[PDB]
Structure 1
């Protein structure tokens, strides 16, 4: 039976997720959880998913952003956002750190808070160490949109949601997503 995404309010979403013992990652139990996360991420088209989002208090995140996913997306947007596809990625016990001080502003959403969006500031490029599916130690360097997904998801592992880190008065309904940014609001884009 495939789990359902839990929403804002459920504590596992706002509480720090504990590590998976490296060596259990190759387990049918954890492997199962990972396959679930991937199935859920794909089943309601999104590009990232963190364990807590399915009631699993473990430090695990998954992400994928496909050519197709992007196929439908304003060429200009794809540009400014610097969104490039990348193969399905799984990371247990990830540890994210910014590679530089360049940032960017764009709208973010979460399957745990649907119907809404909000512009949030993220580092343009980052590095992430941790383990993959088979429990193999890895290091990942990303930038652009993929870098944003990584941050969003990892945040989930420490019980943080975008709504608590969003730009004032940008929060909005999906239907209002592309509405003039109110006077005083920083402008979407990146330093470099």
Structure 2
């Protein structure tokens, strides 16, 4: 049986998620959750996913970018967002910190807020500590689209969705995604 995705409104998404006990990570229980998340993130075309999104108040995130997902987008664009593919990645009790105040601005979308995208600003470089799928402590460094995803998923673990971090007037239907930005809205890209 597969637990589906919670949508905005469900308190689980707007409240800080409890840490999973290191070691208990190897548990057949939490291990199971990691499997589900990974499945769901792949079942609906998603590049990231946080425990609360399937109703689990735990600090666990999974991200992954297929060289196939990327394929379906303007090369001009995927290149601008420094979006390189990476293998599935799992992090429990992650702790994110920017490696520099360098930032970027692009359209983001959440699986708990579908049908909509919105330009949100993100750190370009970031380092995330925590534990790997098997309870061993790791420290992941990343930039570009990957850093973006990590920030997204981590935000979830704190009860935060991009909507409360978006650039005014950029909110839009996935359909009207490519329509121009109205005057005033900052330019997309980076410094």
Q: How many residue pairs get matched?
A: 191
SS of the equivalent of 1:95 reads strand
Distance 2:79 2:134 in 1: 34
What is the RMSD computed on CA atoms of the aligned residues?
0.5
C-alpha displacement at 1:68, in angstroms?
1.0
Residue deviations 1:61-112, cap 9 Å, x none? 0000011111111110111110000010000000000000110000000000
SS of the equivalent of 2:178 reads coil
Distance 2:45 2:64 in 1: 10
When normalised by structure 1's length, the TM-score is 0.99
Structure 1's unaligned 5+ residue stretches are none
Residue deviations 1:33-77, cap 9 Å, x none? 000000000000110000000000000000000111111111101
Give the equivalent residue in structure 2 for 1:181.
Answer: 181
C-alpha displacement at 1:19, in angstroms?
0.2
Distance 2:70 2:169 in 1: 28
Question: Superposed, which structure 2 residues align to 1:54-69 within 5 Å?
Answer: 54-69=54-69
When normalised by structure 2's length, the TM-score is 0.99
C-alpha displacement at 1:129, in angstroms?
0.1
Structure 2's unaligned 5+ residue stretches are none
SS of the equivalent of 2:152 reads helix
Query: Which structure 1 residue ranges, 4+ long, deviate > 2 Å from structure 2?
Result: none
